[PDB]
């Protein structure tokens, strides 16, 4: 498998991060009937590259379904044990998926759990029995780590929402949308303020999700967040990962919103599951991040595009960050499936399980 090529000139501060282009892909230098990589893995990597699956739990679910299909299509070779052979076989697939798009924390945790489950397979176990048990374990993981873990968080966040509240959300989040919909269904009467940002503009995925539910929702961009915050009662933010030092790694417009919310005495709430907890730490968005396609910053304002041909200018760089890190002092409450714990109890949950 050939390595993916870099596109454009990266920033000096982010020169250690890969920057790819959505237009080009690796499937041009691969077999049409895939042989080295599994066809399901190739489809998943193409969907990750084209941006068809652009979430956090959705990416993990798609990866787990592709892994289930691979295990179902897996056949152990002679003279080899399944425990080592499957682990050695699933490594190039993860390398190709990382080449397509940098993996998320949920995907890393799922890969680690599946590797542990495969390594913990006995030798005397039959092939079909082991494959069926692995599929059942993946199904139970999906059930009790995403589906069952969201209902507990929705039930815990219901007692924190009161009548007449003004909740401010940001971007697109499955857990936040589910919590708001269930709170409106239970009987709570409030209104939501949706904040969005360029170039993904995924906040509209939540806005039209609330109007279809009946919740009165407003829409505005992230530069106008300090104007609407004086009327906001509480801020509900989604988390892509909770680091071992209490910091919150999420969409690039999260730490800024939490900082501006602190200046207005607005409590900041973070919702995340226990399967997204990382044992690693991070103090700034410079050591580990993701550089998306820099051609997405181009916008047509008026008649022409100011960034139509930015490659001609030598000293012109286009930075398109994806993730950012929020310090623990800006987070007031963290809602998980175990209960409402402070932002400093992240290692404890990492130690219990």
């Amino acid at each position: 498998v050939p390595t993916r090529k870099d596109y454009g000139s990266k920033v000096s501060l982010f020169s250690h991060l890969p920057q790819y282009s959505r237009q080009n892909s690796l499937t041009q230098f691969m077999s049409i009937p895939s042989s080295v990589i599994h066809p399901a893995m190739v489809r998943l990597g193409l969907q990750y590259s084209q941006g068809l699956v652009s979430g956090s739990n959705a990416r993990c679910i798609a990866l787990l379904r592709a892994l289930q299909q691979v295990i179902q299509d897996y056949t152990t070779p002679p003279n080899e044990e399944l425990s080592r052979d499957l682990v050695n076989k699933l490594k190039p697939y993860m390398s190709f998926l990382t080449q397509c798009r940098p993996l998320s924390a949920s995907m890393h945790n799922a890969i680690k759990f599946l590797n542990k489950e495969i390594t913990s397979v006995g030798s005397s176990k039959r092939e079909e029995e082991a494959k069926s048990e692995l599929r059942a374990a993946i199904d139970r993981y999906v059930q009790e780590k995403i589906v069952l873990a969201a209902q507990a968080i929705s039930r815990f966040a219901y007692q924190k929402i009161s009548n007449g509240d003004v909740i401010l959300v940001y971007g697109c989040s499955s857990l936040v949308s589910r919590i708001l919909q269930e709170a409106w269904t239970e009987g709570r009467r409030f209104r939501v303020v949706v904040v969005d940002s360029r170039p993904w503009l995924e906040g509209r995925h939540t806005l039209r999700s609330l109007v279809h539910a009946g919740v009165p929702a407003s829409y505005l961009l992230i530069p106008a967040a300090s104007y609407v915050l004086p009327e906001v009662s509480k801020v509900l933010l989604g988390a892509h990962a909770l680091l071992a030092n209490g910091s919150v790694m999420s969409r690039v417009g999260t730490a800024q919103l939490a900082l501006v919310a602190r200046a207005h005495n607005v409590p900041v709430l973070v919702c995340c599951e226990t399967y997204k907890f990382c044992e690693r730490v991070q103090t700034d968005a410079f050591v580990s991040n993701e550089l998306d396609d820099p051609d997405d910053l181009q916008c047509k304002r008026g008649e022409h595009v100011a960034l139509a041909n930015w490659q001609n200018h030598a000293s012109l760089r286009l930075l398109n960050l994806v993730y950012d890190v929020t310090p623990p002092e800006l987070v007031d409450l963290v809602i998980t499936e175990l209960g409402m714990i402070p932002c400093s109890s992240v290692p404890v949950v990492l130690r219990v399980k």
Binding site: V11, S12, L13, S197, R198, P199, R204, L207, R208, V211, P216, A217, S218, Y219, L220, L221, I222, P223, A224, A225, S226, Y227, V228, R251, V252, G253, A255, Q256, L259, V260, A263, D284, A285, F286, L297, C299, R301, A306, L307, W310, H313, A314, S315, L316, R317, L318, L319, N320, L321, D324, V325
Partner: protein, 333 residues
């Protein structure tokens, strides 16, 4: 002559309907010229009638557009000039005056002439303001420094392009989401080879830990040292205060307004929601409230320095500069 009437009406509709002079300097220049033409092409025996008609014109101009404070600033400057000339040809409130202590009905012939000449000097000062801010570039920018700016400002652009001919540093431009005018400034800076970078507003805090100094401009400055800047600037000021990063403001003298932050619900400029949410969304536009404020308020405690044509000052001294430009009786106009 009715030519002045046509000019006044055209200027009023140009301010009220859309954007006329796309630069504060040209706006102040045309305001000063129109006020001079009003002073010349009108009959006033004493200074009282002239002051009254100038006040009425400035009031109707500010009623055409409340956010365009440069017109009101120029009107109040002309009023103050008339006041000094009348006081000089005839013969502020403080504790000394309150312990050791007037109408404009008298008539003078050459007075008008003097006033004209006074306006004249102000005119020339205009074509200095920009460079009078640019010449102080090397005194606030050293080599190998990371600088962040937001939006498109001619003053900050001149500052950076004048500091780059002898130094070399890093410049980051955060484009505003409603009006992405930072791309034009980024291209104009990269055309001079300054190693410019482009980013969004959501990342303003993310890279804030790797910025040594922030340099911005504004639309107008309040009497308490506050700022009426483009939206997203309050977030930048908060991020700079969180990391203790100095924030420099490049603004000339004609951007000082004696008004105080007490005119809420009209401080920000609201435009059509087409910029934030497009019209092709569908049926959801009937139940979603979309607001697109153009300007925002920046408190004085988040500012470190003010660079103007007179030099560098602190916000805690702005109250004096106002007293040296406008009269306390012309604050309400």
């Amino acid at each position: 002559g009715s030519e002045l009437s046509e000019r006044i009406e055209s200027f009023v509709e140009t301010l009220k309907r859309g954007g006329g002079p796309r630069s504060s300097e040209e706006m102040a220049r045309e305001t000063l010229g129109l006020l001079r033409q009003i002073i010349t092409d009108h009959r006033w025996s004493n200074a009282g009638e002239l002051m009254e008609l100038i006040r009425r014109e400035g009031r109707r101009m500010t009623a055409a557009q409340p956010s365009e404070t440069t017109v009101g600033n120029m009107v109040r400057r002309v009023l103050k000039i008339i006041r000094e000339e009348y006081g000089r040809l005839h013969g502020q409130e403080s504790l000394h005056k309150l312990l050791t202590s007037e109408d404009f009905s008298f008539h003078y012939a050459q007075l008008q002439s003097n006033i004209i000449e006074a306006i004249n000097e102000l005119l020339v000062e205009l074509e200095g303001t920009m460079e009078n801010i640019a010449a102080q570039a090397l005194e606030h920018i050293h080599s190998n420094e990371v600088i962040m700016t937001i939006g498109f400002s001619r003053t900050v652009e001149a500052f950076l392009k004048e500091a780059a001919r002898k130094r070399k540093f890093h410049v980051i431009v955060a484009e505003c989401a409603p009006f992405c005018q930072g791309h034009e400034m980024a291209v104009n800076l990269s055309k001079a080879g300054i190693e410019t970078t482009v980013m969004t507003d959501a990342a303003i805090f993310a890279v804030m830990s790797r910025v040594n100094k922030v340099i911005i401009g504004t639309k107008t400055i309040l009497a308490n040292g506050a700022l009426r800047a483009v939206t997203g600037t309050h977030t930048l000021a908060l991020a700079a205060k969180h990391h203790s990063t100095p924030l420099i403001v490049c603004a000339p003298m004609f951007k000082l307004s004696p008004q105080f932050p007490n005119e809420e619900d009209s401080f920000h400029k609201f435009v059509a929601p087409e910029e934030v949410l497009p019209f092709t969304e569908g049926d959801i536009l009937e139940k979603v409230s979309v607001h697109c404020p153009v300007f925002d308020y920046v408190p004085p405690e988040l500012i470190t320095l003010f660079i103007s044509n007179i030099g560098g000052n602190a916000p805690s001294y702005i109250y004096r500069l106002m007293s040296e430009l406008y009269h306390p009786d012309d604050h309400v106009l």
